[PDB]
């Protein structure tokens, strides 16, 4: 849910002392998954078959 | 000394939830390492 419930997870303790506490590392969402082949030039002349 | 910050896991594999299973299924060694590097960081805040 909550950054502070997560710090409490990190503490293992209910109880929180004054300070600042490093919990996790944030993490930037993937987007727009892309596969981009190059300019296409010279393909089979299948009609010749 | 330089006070680091480390995104341990993502170095440890880099964006694989499958990994994270394998790591929590390996333990919490990266966690001990983070505590070590926070202890460094406070030690040299204190040193300064
Ligand atoms: C309607 C028609 O004529 N289609 C053909 C096509 O099937 C063939 O791949 C191409 C190359 O020969 O020539 C044209």
From Swiss-Prot, chain A:
Changing residue 47 to H: In strain: Omicron/BA.2.75, Omicron/XBB.1.5, Omicron/EG.5.1. It comes from the Viruses. Glycans are attached at residues 31, 33, 39. Residues 27-43 are annotated as: Disordered. Changing residue 47 to D: In strain: Omicron/BA.1, Omicron/BA.2, Omicron/BA.2.12.1, Omicron/BA.4, Omicron/BA.5, Omicron/BQ.1.1. Binds to host ACE2. RBD also interacts with the N-linked glycan on 'Asn-90' of ACE2. Cleavage of S generates a polybasic C-terminal sequence on S1 that binds to host Neuropilin-1 (NRP1) and Neuropilin-2 (NRP2) receptors. Interacts with host integrin alpha-5/beta-1 (ITGA5:ITGB1) and with ACE2 in complex with integrin alpha-5/beta-1 (ITGA5:ITGB1). May interact via cytoplasmic c-terminus with M protein. May interact (via N-terminus) with host bilirubin and biliverdin, thereby preventing antibody binding to the SARS-CoV-2 spike NTD via an allosteric mechanism. Attaches the virion to the cell membrane by interacting with host receptor, initiating the infection. The major receptor is host ACE2. When S2/S2' has been cleaved, binding to the receptor triggers direct fusion at the cell membrane. When S2/S2' has not been cleaved, binding to the receptor results in internalization of the virus by endocytosis using host TFRC and GRM2 and leading to fusion of the virion membrane with the host endosomal membrane. Alternatively, may use NRP1/NRP2 and integrin as entry receptors. This is Spike protein S1. It comes from Severe acute respiratory syndrome coronavirus 2 (2019-nCoV). The gene is S. The chain holds residues 293 to 341 of 1273 of the full protein.
């Amino acid at each position: 849910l909550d950054p502070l419930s997560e710090t409490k997870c990190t503490l293992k303790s209910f109880t929180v002392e004054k300070g600042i506490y490093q919990t996790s590392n944030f993490r930037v969402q993937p987007t727009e998954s892309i596969v981009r082949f190059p300019n296409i030039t010279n393909l089979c002349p299948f009609g010749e078959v | 000394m330089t006070k680091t910050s480390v995104d341990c896991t993502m170095y440890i594999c880099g964006d694989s939830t499958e990994c994270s299973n394998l790591l929590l299924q390996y333990g919490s060694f990266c966690t001990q390492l983070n505590r070590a590097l926070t202890g460094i960081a406070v030690e040299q805040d204190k040193n300064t």
